[PDB]
Ligand code: HEM
Ligand code: HEM
Ligand SMILES: C[C@H](O)[C@H](O)[C@H]1CNc2nc(N)[nH]c(=O)c2N1
Ligand SMILES: C[C@H](O)[C@H](O)[C@H]1CNc2nc(N)[nH]c(=O)c2N1
């Protein structure tokens with residue numbers, strides 16, 4: 043089989059063979075497409091085959107397929123699984139898997155960087171405090187004074203699912219949200235539920251607008267614990283506008299390190315419930331989503347009022363106009379403070395390049411158009427005119443239930 | 453089974469039961485999503501007809517009745533005899549209105565029922581088609597107060613007597629390749645602009661030249677016609693704050709009329725069914741004017757605004773885009789021609805969805821196409837989860853006539 047993909051702006055066509063290896067479901071039938079849907083304890087019998095294909099790929103990548111190191115490893119694993127039920131990965135395998143989980147992330151436009159990832163082996167960690175130390179080093183190394191570096195910390199893999207390691211925060215660094223009795227919201231509405239759990243666990247919230255949330259870390263299945271990330275480790279950028287001198291008076295600022303922490307990393311059947319991972323922001327995620335989604339800091343009205351725009355009738359595009367300035371500002375502020383960041387034009391052009399290379403490299407590049415195209419100026423970026431095939435490959439990063447909806451408290 | 457759809461901006465969850473009645477395939481599989489891919493007999497005809505007639509009667513509260521059953525037999529026998537059949541007027545109107553209703557890629561379906569249907573089934577010639585099309589263009593333009601419309605020429609018979617409108621739209625600008633290697637006018641039509649030339653049309657080699665209609669009837673060779681200029685409502689694009697805009701010398705037409713699609717109703721295929729409504733601002737502002745392969749005016753527009761085009765991070769393309777789309781919506785309103793912006797259009801669609809889910813059990817929607825090509829996440833339709841599936845009656849793509857005609 044072969045599947046064709048065309049770019050309606052360069053007439054450039056590509057052939058995908060990689061999709062043949064995709065096993066998992068996508069949520070789509072031959073009769074229904076759920077492409078725009080958000081979210082459409084493994085037995086011994088299930089584990090080995092998964093371990094096998096993984097180790098087969100690993101070895102193939104290092105050009106040692108069928109070798110002696112290859113077979114002995116398969117025999118070693120098969121045996122270990124039979125007696126211990128599970129199995130531990132070698133460092134080189136963990137490193138290989140992590141990079142590939144990233145490489146297979148169909149919703150990630152910054153994948154050109156997949157190969158350059160710093161993997162921290164946190165499998166010897168045993169307590170929440172231990173996790174705090176590990177996280178702190180991840181944040182420090184990754185931030186690098188503004189010159190960001192990719193990185194991921196991998197904590198202990200799941201055993202019986204009763205002893206999971208989990209990072210309760212969705213991102214290692216994030217602002218608190220507090221619902222006021224008057225119905226309004228202070229801070230980031232997206233984090234209100236979590237902000238609550240934190241206060242209910244002992245966090246003394248400053249009750250401000252940009253309060254860096256505390257980490258709630260869960261080790262070996264025990265109750266989660268609170269910790270405050272060293273302020274001197276949390277790099278932040280105050281947002282001002284290049285020409286709008288009233289912008290600085292909006293009181294806005296954002297953190298520099300985006301590090302998702304609620305996903306699950308699957309490598310060769312093994313599940314890693316806690317695997318925080320960071321890279322570096324694309325302007326629009328802060329500029330259009332965090333600042334402008336109606337359900338976030340929703341700053342359009344106030345940025346428009348001060349821009350003195352005709353907010354009488356939407357056909358004036360006061361919202362579109364304000365959005366560009368706001369994004370102008372997020373990018374300008376980061377550049378001025380020498381903190382890594384990429385704009386949607388650069389990131390998307392690079393992605394097309396990475397994408398093409400990946401077709402002539404491994405016969406495909408699973409991509410989710412809905413998530414790849416930016417939340418603004420979509421059609422003036424190259425990814426918009428790009429056809430994409432979306433399929434699941436392992437290793438992978440998956441969503442998982444929020445830890446508070448399942449955890450059995452002691 | 454039973455699928456639910458959530459809006460992540462309002463948390464509203466709707467339940468879809470309509471997809472169960474899905475016929476054609478989507479191109480996807482459990483193994484691969486093709487969401488972003490632009491395009492993935494007597495025994496055959498009667499079942500298709502029955503399904504349609506069934507829906508029709510169910511819609512008029514006469515499901516099963518004698519009328520229902522009678523007509524069902526009438527058609528059955530007709531197909532048995534004439535190897536095909538003809539739709540009563542009421543079924544045609546319903547069929548067309550419902551093909552629109554089922555257009556998963558159209559954001560303006562909230563207007564689905566308010567569609568004027570012109571029955572051009574008795575047409576026999578290209579001149580006849582011009583007369584029909586002309587009346588269609590004048591009725592829908594209505595001096596700027598646009599009205600939705602569709603004209604349906606004779607349905608297919610043996611496939612060698614196909615009625616077709618070679619233009620992709622009843623009204624579009626010509627595109628010409630210049631000595632240089634560049635392109636004058638609209639690149640999207642360069643080819644067709646050539647076929648019109650190879651056929652006789654005297655191309656004025658201008659930036660915005662209104663192409664001629666190339667009409668085909670009963671499988672014959674296509675003929676050329678010039679839509680009465682008095683019937684082609686155009687708008688010069690000026691900016692509400694940049695008096696230098698006019699100097700860009702831009703103008704677009706007011707009537708969006710897709711004409712290269714094929715309408716299927718109850719098994720029957722109407723290969724010539726031009727339909728029109730009114731423009732959503734972004735279609736012209738961002739796609740027609742800014743798309744790299746179209747007019748690609750961004751570089752010049754930026755200049756004139758005197759902004760740093762040295763680094764992409766200045767968002768000068770973004771900057772220009774907004775102003776260019778301001779100018780489009782601005783001009784249309786000032787000349788009192790109907791037009792809708794991406795903000796109102798999408799808000800309207802959401803409501804339409806809320807109605808369709810309770811009044812029909814769902815609404816087939818293609819996210820990739822519904823989300824406007826600018827300010828996507830600030831329009832409500834961005835956070836709206838969608839379910840795409842194909843339903844008939846429907847509008848489908850079909851091969852360009854020049855790539856399949858026997859002259
Ligand atoms: C180098 C900087 C990087 C950039 C600029 C980049 C950019 C992005 C963006 C814009 C998204 C969509 C964000 C959203 O709307 O929520 C995304 C998604 C994602 N990225 Fe990256 N990324 C980078 C690094 C990483 C790293 C290091 C990994 C993993 C090791 C990764 C894995 C993913 C995953 C799994 C998602 C989807 C998350 C979800 O399903 O919600 N990205 N990335
Ligand atoms: C009344 C105003 C209407 C508005 C504002 C509207 C708007 C839209 C938009 C924005 C698209 C995507 C355009 C593109 O990117 O090419 C579209 C596509 C479409 N619309 Fe509408 N529409 C309207 C009326 C109609 C009518 C009257 C019909 C049919 C009776 C219709 C049938 C369709 C179809 C089939 C498509 C998809 C065609 C394709 O795949 O290229 N629309 N519409
Ligand atoms: C409903 C729809 O799936 C949802 O709004 C998606 C669309 N595309 C997205 N794309 C990115 N990058 N991030 C998001 O959160 C979303 N949300
Ligand atoms: C490749 C991709 O399918 C293609 O660029 C689509 C995306 N969404 C679109 N949406 C609309 N409304 N119109 C288009 O022409 C497209 N092009």
Ligand SMILES: O=[N+]([O-])c1cccc2c(Br)n[nH]c12
Nearest residue numbers: 300319320321322323324327
């Ligand atoms: O840049 N982003 O917009 C963005 C969003 C979500 C996750 C990440 C990571 Br990990 N790096 N950058 C990201």
Ligand SMILES: O=[N+]([O-])c1cccc2c(Br)n[nH]c12
Nearest residue numbers: 708727728729730731732735
């Ligand atoms: O508004 N649009 O962008 C648009 C595009 C393509 C076709 C139509 C029709 Br018919 N009405 N509006 C349309």
Ligand SMILES: [Zn+2]
Nearest residue numbers: 070075480485
């Ligand atoms: Zn799909």
